């Protein structure tokens, strides 16, 4: 019944971005959120310089319509600090500081030389080919705003300004655990109607990849006290606590009563597929997210619900989810109205070089293979029914969490 | 003159993937390359279970036509081993072991409660809703092939099979350093015609993100011996050695003679933009990659040349570079024939929901901002000249290294 958009907004609207911070050397800043604006301490370039290599001139002598002889020259880091006779021009090479009083620079290709004077050609519009100091970055200016996720794109720029460290928001801390007597650890023998715990591993990997500090409390035994203990501990050192499975997401049982006892938890029924149930609310000092037991369902719910909440909490101003794009289906897709279906597909280039999607196969949640075989989500609109080969469809490519 | 494709093939063809390996617990395997095939130790599913929530029935009981009292139940970790007499049914939850003798399983909707048992409204087909032991993964089968990069998509599947660890190829070791008296460290005062070293930081970040073990030797002083020492050490504990700048990529000088003295190094002139010069060859026990001094150039060369070499060396069987797609330009693009131009652009959805690219602005290599403003490469064909708004163009979206 409830819609993804609704739950998402309801979730993000209640959360307050972290503000605690620490200062680290650039090399340790990948994926981190800048705590404050980065203001440039210097100008870049620090002085007016040549856009092309050619000739530095004064709009005056260009009226002579006669050859201008090179009085001097200015290169890389060897400016021309000398007298500039009238009617003459300076030989200059890109990045080189324009000469005192230079009104324009001309690319030699736009000026046939001579063995006695430089003949110009196309009029020389003022300021042509002159990069003015602070044109790129002017001292005092804001280079990168707070809330920016530092990447290979920004850190080297910050280093170019001479800064060795920057304040970043502390990593988000997340407590993780599962519960259920039927859950067994890898390496351990499978009991009667037992199964190996897999959701927890899934959530742990994603959290780490998302840059969070993970606190894995393991499998909690089916006991009212063990569970309460687990929650008290999780809430005490994490901003968010996640149940990868076992704790109630609606159904009645002791886990449900412990949840209601320890916080304000809502039990939503999202109109999505796979999945539907999701637990969300506030514990004493953390946010709680409860995932359904089904592997496909938990992964999907975490990826579309928890991920965005972690992005906001982190201080990051960009919506930490990939963008969608319209593409054509090359597979008939089975879809039932009433739920927003996040099917898995395979985005690929066709013969004509265009992008099309193929289903990964069976979309049932009884298997996990679709995540490996696919590379995207074919997000089918809630109201839509079956889709025929050739129809337009929305696609959301997987991010680094899946390859 | 030489083409990207050529150099790439020439490079990959000479390299041999690493084979050394180590075994680690799944949680430490993200981004790692599987050293050997993963063979499933059991059938999946592990035992006939229920595809839904409802009741286990037998065609005969359903046949009689009247209510079937609930002789018992079967839950997650609670398989029913009761008696199950004629004319009765067993309540069953999803994933629950189907009871012995179970011939089918009906869901709620097809059920209507009674005061003297349960009523089955809809038709019940033989074998319906019973997931059969092994209908997904058969024991002895190969689940994931060696050379596979482990992700959230695969690791939880491997955990579902009970396996706690897997052999993976050891991380690729890379030695990194720069040289040049003009290079200054962050925090340190800028000398005369000095500049802050930025390429090294850039390469270090990317390498770490690519999953490599980085050995940063810092800035090497302009001395024939200091440089030789740096190389001897780098080559002695790395599979690849990278010069982020300073060492020759063609031009004549002492760094060139040390290179030629320590290995078989080729000095290529690629028909690409930005960039052109690239040094590649074999040292005593490693591969050497030499990057041009310009920041934009070094980044681009590393990203399109070194990255793919690292992917192969790692044992990974998938081409570690993003795919391209055809999109329309919404910006006039200035392009000169003769070089494959990797311009930076901004991929975005337009009013009609279609994808289009906009230039980030000036494509000159005198600035680094394009990497931050953009989100992709507009890969312009070597022979192509200017591009007008509305033309078809090839786009390569940035990967995690840039956001």
Swiss-Prot record, chains A, B:
Needed cofactors: Mg(2+)
Cofactor note: Binds 1 Mg(2+) ion per subunit.
A Pfam family hit: MoCF_biosynth
Keyword Magnesium applies: yes
Entry GO MF terms: identical protein binding; metal ion binding; molybdopterin molybdotransferase activity; protein homodimerization activity
Gene Ontology terms describing biological process: Mo-molybdopterin cofactor biosynthetic process
Keywords for this protein: Magnesium, Metal-binding, Molybdenum, Molybdenum cofactor biosynthesis, Transferase
GO cellular component: cytoplasm; cytosol
Metabolic or biological pathway: Cofactor biosynthesis; molybdopterin biosynthesis
EC number: 2.10.1.1
PROSITE patterns associated with the record: MOCF_BIOSYNTHESIS_2
Source domain of life: Bacteria
Catalysed transformations (reactions): adenylyl-molybdopterin + molybdate = Mo-molybdopterin + AMP + H(+)
Family: Belongs to the MoeA family.
NCBIfam families referenced in this protein's UniProt entry, alphabetically: Glp_gephyrin (NF045515), molyb_syn (TIGR00177), PRK10680.1 (NF007960)
Function: Catalyzes the insertion of molybdate into adenylated molybdopterin with the concomitant release of AMP.
Subunit structure: Homodimer. Interacts with MobA, MogA and MobB in vivo.
Protein name (record): Molybdopterin molybdenumtransferase
Organism: Escherichia coli (strain K12)
Lineage of origin: Bacteria, Pseudomonadati, Pseudomonadota, Gammaproteobacteria, Enterobacterales
């Amino acid at each position: 019944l409830m819609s993804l958009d609704t739950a998402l907004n309801e979730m993000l609207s209640r959360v307050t971005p972290l503000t605690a911070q620490e200062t680290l050397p650039l090399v340790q800043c990948f994926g981190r959120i800048l705590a404050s604006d980065v203001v440039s301490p210097l100008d870049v370039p620090g002085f007016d310089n040549s856009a092309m290599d050619g000739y530095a001139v004064r709009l005056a002598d260009i009226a002579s319509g006669q050859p201008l002889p090179v009085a001097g020259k200015s290169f890389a880091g060897q400016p021309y600090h000398g007298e500039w006779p009238a009617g003459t021009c300076i030989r200059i090479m890109t990045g080189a500081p324009v000469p005192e009083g230079c009104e324009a620079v001309v690319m030699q290709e736009q000026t046939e030389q001579m063995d006695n004077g430089v003949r110009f050609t196309a009029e020389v519009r003022s300021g042509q080919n002159i990069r003015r100091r602070g044109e790129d970055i002017s001292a005092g200016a804001v280079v990168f705003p707070a809330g920016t996720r530092l990447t290979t794109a920004e850190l080297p720029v910050i280093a170019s300004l001479g800064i060795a460290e920057v304040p970043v928001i502390r990593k988000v801390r997340v407590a993780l655990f599962s519960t259920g007597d039927e859950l067994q650890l890898p390496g351990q023998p499978l009991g009667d109607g037992q199964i190996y715990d897999t959701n927890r591993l899934a959530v742990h990997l994603m959290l780490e990849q998302l840059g969070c500090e993970v606190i894995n409390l393991g499998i909690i035994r089916d006991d009212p006290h063990a569970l309460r203990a687990a929650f008290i501990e999780a809430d005490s050192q994490a901003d968010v606590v996640i149940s990868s499975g076992g704790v109630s997401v609606g159904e009645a049982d002791y886990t449900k009563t412990i949840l209601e006892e320890l916080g304000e938890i809502a039990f939503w029924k999202l109109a999505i597929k796979p999945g539907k149930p999701f637990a969300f609310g506030k514990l004493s000092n953390s946010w709680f997210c409860g995932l359904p037991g089904n592997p496909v369902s938990a992964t999907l719910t975490f990826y579309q619900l928890v991920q965005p909440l972690l992005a906001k909490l982190s201080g990051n101003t960009a919506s930490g989810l990939p963008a969608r794009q319209r593409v054509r289906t090359a597979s008939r897709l089975k879809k039932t109205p009433g739920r927003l279906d996040f099917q898995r597909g395979v985005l690929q280039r066709n013969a004509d070089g265009e992008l099309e999607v193929t289903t990964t196969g069976h979309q049932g949640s009884h298997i996990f293979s679709s995540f490996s075989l696919g590379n995207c989500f074919i997000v089918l609109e809630r109201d839509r029914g079956n889709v025929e080969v050739g129809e337009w469809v929305e696609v959301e490519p997987f991010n680094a969490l899946f390859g």
